Design a protein around this ligand. Structure first.
Ligand SMILES: O=C[C@@H](O)[C@@H](O)[C@@H](O)CO
Ligand SMILES: O=C[C@@H](O)[C@@H](O)[C@@H](O)CO
Ligand SMILES: O[C@@H]1[C@H](O)[C@@H](O)OC[C@@H]1O
Ligand SMILES: O[C@@H]1[C@H](O)[C@@H](O)OC[C@@H]1O
Ligand SMILES: O[C@@H]1[C@H](O)[C@@H](O)OC[C@@H]1O
Ligand SMILES: O[C@@H]1[C@H](O)[C@@H](O)OC[C@@H]1O
Ligand SMILES: O[C@@H]1[C@H](O)[C@@H](O)OC[C@@H]1O
Ligand SMILES: O[C@@H]1[C@H](O)[C@@H](O)OC[C@@H]1O
Ligand SMILES: [Mn+2]
Ligand SMILES: [Mn+2]
Ligand SMILES: [Mn+2]
Ligand SMILES: [Mn+2]
Lengths: 242, 242, 242, 242
């Protein structure tokens, strides 16, 4: 069974992704195309390359090209240092092939928004937030109810139940209003298995805390991604390339 | 002297801007194309329409198509409500015609980033931040020094003095990495007068406090745009459309 | 009544057209943006500027940006000189605002194809060709039957009957197969009056004979455009700019 | 040595090419993505897939997405049937990966033009045309002289001699005007080996006589592509897909 992605498969994967990105005018510089841009959520997901990104089979694998991840700490009153981690600015372009997913997870600090550029994006999420740390939190524009799931959605083998809690559904297309995914909400999304093209979506969010193999001292070693499936909560880290 | 823009001049201005935006794949919704999107920074700037947006003359007027201005207050610990106004997520496409400017100003709370989509962007700014209050302010990655202004830049008549403090200069082009403009920094920008196309720039910043059309009680009536020129300061809002 | 287009209206018209073109990646160089690119079919059509290109009123006015018009005579056996005028290569980008048309006409020599890039294009045409010169002509892929006209089409005032002979209709969208309009077929097209954006279509055709204010001697002074409305068959020539 | 391409390698190749094409707004229909679109010029060129399309190695292989190949025979006077094969309209998007080439060859009948959409195109050609027959041939605007080849160009092993006659060189970039390649001129082109993206070029030419999948009886079985290298000449058609 696949336990890693060959160097050829990885380079072709990231090279076509970055080319598609540039074609769509996304600002891609060389340092953005690296060994951690092509993510495989869990070792059992390397099997996605047994048949390839165009097999239309359900797997949690994607490429992320990050053009910005600004802490936005400069100029902030020291008084706000404690919650500065809930702010910041991040701009990423995400490429998901037909039938593949960004697995169920949530962020304690990061609030994000989606802009579909190419293809269509099916988002699965939980309208009710979880509570992390202090129970006292602000509220303004609670997550919408969306719709129930459509029929025929193929979920990854052995990961089906990690989607049980993401009962709301919304299908996003290019040109639709920006979709906001508030922090502390379980969410996931896939590119329709029958899509003629890879899904390309721009994510604009607050700072993305993802320890790489510090704006403020309390930001060091901060992990802001909590995955439902324990198996994927691990792989998100590094990519096994052979 | 022009004291307003005609309905025809306005509708054509906004219609061509929205078309250009859609062509570049920016998500424009009908609600984004409104009578507040075409901005004229001061009553003496309505004169820009005496000769038109292709006269290549120096005036402070522009179009802003805002696709997102998310408070990002939901899920934020109440303990951080006092500095929430420094966060949030704003996504807008700015369209500036040849020779025109986004007037000198700074934001106490908003930190922005620029992504040139079409044409080129000449940015003028103060490398040193203005001191709003005095209390401890955080630091991490101060504004780069930049370069001196090139020769040839024509400033708006009567407003040239307001650009005196913006000694640093940088020319951004499509494909360049993201350029960050930290809060409390005086800045302005223009589309080169010789440009064959309007400057089209995607701005991703923190929340934009601009009563144009409340997430938190404190945010009510808050204005986070302070312009160097008084003329553009006060009479900056509502656009006079005849 | 309008008998010409002001210099401001023309420059704004062509400048936005060329910017939209470049945004769509069409190869536009300065010599392409000239005094003959913005066409007004007949002096009675200058009235289109009384209310402007965004009034959605029916008029026969459009901009044509020609990037190629290659005779393709080089290398051709001298034996084919006689019909060389039916060959050649022409590449043009056409921009038609909401509700405006490219008027009923036909070409004796030019065969063309359409590729909608932005917006939608409604083509009105005659499936049966006319005979010009010798009656003996080749046949292979006769023009399709298309569909009858949809309801609600607003035709230009005083030009309604020039559309009587173009009974077939087809609506083209971005991504559809190339639509071929064989030579000697009456045709016209408009941008839906309710369109949010100007129609942008790429035309790939054989050489475009349009005497400007010679590959082969018999090509000198060749006029290959025959308009139904005599009033437009004249204006096609030059553009009255004041 | 590789003697064919696997179904997976082929489907990924064509799928990513079609996606990139659609991203750039080229009109791709399902029928355009077929088993004849991925071209391998000679059995010894299948070795390009030993290391892949991103190995940046010199091989003669490419993808052609043909949206149009119109005879333009309809309405053509019978008197010009003998030279109809030199006319017609062909529109195709060519996708060439870093380091790869469109092998040396000339067309007796087809005249082409290039429009670079993404990346850069290095064209190698003979400024003087080859003399097919001898009969009078027409002239109007002979091929420009061009410049000498730059240093660094790696040619395909075993085919380097076939490029000896293509002494002229020109580097085309997106936004450049159309570049015409008159018929009877030997030519070849490649995507620079250091390119971060595949070369994407729109070709507009006269009819392409290439029995891949009759407008005139004479056109039956006609092949208008003559390659310098015999290897690529004969075994150029059908792609061996395992
Ligand atoms: O760069 C300028 C941005 O902050 C703009 O959205 C505001 O200044 C509006 O004038
Ligand atoms: O430049 C090359 C073009 O003629 C191509 O469409 C053919 O040569 C196919 O090999
Ligand atoms: O994934 C492979 C290929 O890319 C697809 O087209 O068919 C199935 C095969 O396993
Ligand atoms: O941060 C990455 C992505 O930007 C987000 O949408 O989902 C989690 C993933 O690790
Ligand atoms: O005064 C302006 C600016 O502040 C200075 O740095 O360069 C000249 C310009 O006019
Ligand atoms: O054409 C003018 C304007 O551009 C449009 O929006 O409304 C009608 C007016 O006459
Ligand atoms: O040649 C122009 C255009 O390219 C064609 O489609 O219609 C006639 C007009 O004059
Ligand atoms: O032989 C090739 C070409 O014909 C010549 O002009 O430059 C060197 C190259 O290898
Ligand atoms: Mn997420
Ligand atoms: Mn600002
Ligand atoms: Mn025509
Ligand atoms: Mn060729």
């Amino acid at each position: 069974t696949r336990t890693a992605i060959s160097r050829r498969e990885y380079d072709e994967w990231l090279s076509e992704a970055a080319s598609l990105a540039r074609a769509l005018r996304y600002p891609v510089t060389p340092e953005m195309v690296n060994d951690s841009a092509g993510i495989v959520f869990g070792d059992d997901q390397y099997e996605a390359f047994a048949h390839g990104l165009w097999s239309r089979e359900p797997y949690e694998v994607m490429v992320i090209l990050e053009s910005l991840n600004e802490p936005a700490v400069d100029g902030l009153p020291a008084a706000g240092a404690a919650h500065a981690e809930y702010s910041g600015l991040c701009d990423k372009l995400m490429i998901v092939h037909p039938g593949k997913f960004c697995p169920p997870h949530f962020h304690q600090r990061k609030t994000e928004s989606y802009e579909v550029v190419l293809g269509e994006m099916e988002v699965f999420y939980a309208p009710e937030p979880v509570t992390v740390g202090d129970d006292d939190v602000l509220s303004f524009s609670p997550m919408p109810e969306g719709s129930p799931w459509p029929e025929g959605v193929a979920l990854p083998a052995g990961r089906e139940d990690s989607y049980a809690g993401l009962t709301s559904y919304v299908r996003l297309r290019a040109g639709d209003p920006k979709f906001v995914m508030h922090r502390k909400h379980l969410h996931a999304f896939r590119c329709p298995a029958d899509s003629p093209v890879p899904l390309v979506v721009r994510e604009v969010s607050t700072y993305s805390h993802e320890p790489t193999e510090a704006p403020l001292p309390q930001w060091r070693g901060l992990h802001d991604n909590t995955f439902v499936a324990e198996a994927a909560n691990s792989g998100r880290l590094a990519t096994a390339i052979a």
